[PDB]
């Protein structure tokens, strides 16, 4: 149980309110040791954030468009070093040093402040409530059809309730087309093995390692129970 | 012997562990070039660079 939390603890790297730091990016830059990403090596940026905060969550932008009506995406920040410290430079720039996680940091890339977030292996069993229903999309991976594992964000209706439930059942909904008598086509759900563990940050959505029983299912397909 | 075996063949049949190898490669260009060509030209009195 503990590993498959800490695949997962190797995926959490998505965060919200990638608005904030649209408003306010700190910005890296360098070519003193020019790099897009490193373990221990120095970078430079521009911001207040070399004056406060030494370390730092670097995180690229996504979009998780919900609510058409409303037409709000509440973004994706996908956190590129695991971490970062800081010497201060004068220019508000600053030289910092990157324990990286996997993820390239652009040299022109965004920089918002570190915020760490305790997750634990107790999520494992489970918290299954049906009553939660929705679509997913805006995965990392950007590829439909993702098994075994992955990273999802789970929709904003879909959102809300996943803050009442954290488990559900995967269904990806198939159109069938009457093709020798109308050519009507009908999308039918199919329910699929495998199922979500949600880890929800309110005011954003739920990033949920979902783990696949087989059934490969687009990016866009119905979450339910 | 057998038994001892027995104990062989427990360790031996090992589930094999598999591993998702993600190696990334990341190619960054950024080129810059300006040229100016500077002209100055006159055949009425033949002075021309």
């Given at each position: 149980?503990l590993?498959?939390?800490?695949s997962?603890?190797?995926?959490?790297?998505?965060?919200?309110?990638?608005?904030?730091?649209?408003?306010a990016?700190?910005?890296?830059?360098?070519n003193?040791?020019?790099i897009?990403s490193g373990?221990?090596?120095?970078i430079?940026?521009?911001?207040?954030?070399?004056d406060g905060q030494?370390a730092?969550?670097?995180?690229?932008?996504?979009?998780?468009?919900?609510?058409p009506?409303?037409?709000?995406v509440l973004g994706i920040?996908?956190?590129?070093?695991?971490?970062?410290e800081?010497?201060?430079?004068?220019?508000?720039?600053?030289?910092?040093?990157?324990?990286?996680?996997?993820?390239?940091?652009?040299?022109?890339?965004?920089?918002?402040?570190?915020?760490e977030?305790a997750?634990?292996?107790?999520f494992?069993?489970?918290?299954?409530?049906?009553?939660?229903?929705?679509?997913?999309?805006?995965?990392?991976?950007?590829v439909?059809?993702?098994?075994?594992?992955?990273?999802?964000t789970?929709?904003?209706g879909?959102?809300?309730?996943?803050?009442?439930?954290?488990?559900?059942?995967i269904?990806?909904?198939?159109?069938?087309?009457?093709?020798?008598?109308?050519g009507?086509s009908?999308?039918?759900?199919?329910?699929?093995?495998?199922?979500?563990?949600v880890?929800?940050?309110?005011?954003?959505?739920?990033?949920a390692?979902?783990?696949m029983?087989?059934?490969?299912?687009?990016?866009?397909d119905?979450?339910?129970? | 012997?057998?038994?001892?075996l027995?104990?062989?063949?427990?360790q031996?049949?090992?589930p094999?562990?598999?591993?998702?190898?993600?190696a990334?490669?990341?190619?960054?260009?950024?080129?810059?070039?300006?040229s100016?060509?500077v002209?100055?030209?006159?055949?009425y009195?033949k002075?021309?660079?």
């Amino acid at each position: 149980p503990l590993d498959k939390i800490n695949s997962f603890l190797l995926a959490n790297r998505i965060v919200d309110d990638e608005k904030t730091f649209t408003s306010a990016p700190y910005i890296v830059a360098g070519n003193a040791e020019r790099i897009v990403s490193g373990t221990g090596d120095r970078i430079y940026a521009r911001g207040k954030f070399a004056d406060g905060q030494p370390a730092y969550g670097i995180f690229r932008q996504g979009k998780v468009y919900i609510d058409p009506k409303t037409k709000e995406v509440l973004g994706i920040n996908a956190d590129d070093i695991g971490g970062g410290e800081v010497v201060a430079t004068e220019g508000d720039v600053a030289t910092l040093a990157l324990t990286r996680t996997t993820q390239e940091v652009r040299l022109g890339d965004r920089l918002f402040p570190t915020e760490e977030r305790a997750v634990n292996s107790t999520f494992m069993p489970g918290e299954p409530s049906r009553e939660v229903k929705g679509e997913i999309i805006d995965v990392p991976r950007g590829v439909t059809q993702i098994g075994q594992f992955d990273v999802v964000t789970l929709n904003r209706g879909q959102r809300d309730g996943l803050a009442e439930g954290n488990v559900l059942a995967i269904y990806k909904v198939g159109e069938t087309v009457r093709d020798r008598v109308t050519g009507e086509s009908v999308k039918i759900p199919d329910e699929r093995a495998g199922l979500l563990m949600v880890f929800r940050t309110y005011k954003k959505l739920s990033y949920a390692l979902v783990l696949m029983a087989s059934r490969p299912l687009s990016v866009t397909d119905r979450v339910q129970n | 012997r057998l038994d001892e075996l027995r104990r062989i063949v427990s360790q031996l049949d090992i589930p094999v562990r598999q591993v998702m190898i993600e190696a990334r490669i990341v190619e960054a260009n950024v080129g810059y070039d300006k040229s100016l060509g500077v002209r100055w030209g006159g055949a009425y009195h033949k002075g021309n660079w």
